[PDB]
Structure 1
């Protein structure tokens, strides 16, 4: 006789999990691209220093 309370509890539990999974997948995919661009920029700075 408490089906509404059960559905509210599953809504809360299933709504937090989607947010945290999105947050994790997005953070890993932006930091990977930042890491690769950082490495490319470092190689460019070495070439500019030897050129100069």
Structure 2
């Protein structure tokens, strides 16, 4: 339930003369992707032991 959601946009398009935007857009998008993998995974691995120990 804590996964608050909102309208999101896709990676936009750029012409060949504005490549700096494309890499900046990739860096921010990849940064969030890397964050959520480790954050989400380590949550269900740490909290799987919590429930197993609880039982």
TM over 0.5: yes
Which runs of at least 4 in structure 1 moved beyond 2 Å after TM superposition?
A: none
Quote how far apart the aligned CAs of 1:18 are: 0.6
Give the whole-Å Cα distance in 2 for the aligned partners of 1:15 and 1:36: 32
Structure 1 length-normalised TM: 0.71
Gaps of 5+ in 1: 40-52
What SS class does the counterpart of residue 9 from structure 1 fall into?
A: helix
Higher relative contact order (CA 8 A, sep 6+): 2
Across the aligned residues of Structure 1 and Structure 2, the Cα RMSD in angstroms comes to: 0.6
Residue number in structure 2 paired with 1:35: 51
Residue number in structure 2 paired with 1:49: none
Residue number in structure 2 paired with 1:10: 26
Structure 2 length-normalised TM: 0.67
Residue 36 of structure 2: which of 13, 17, 20 is its match?
A: 20
Count of paired positions: 39
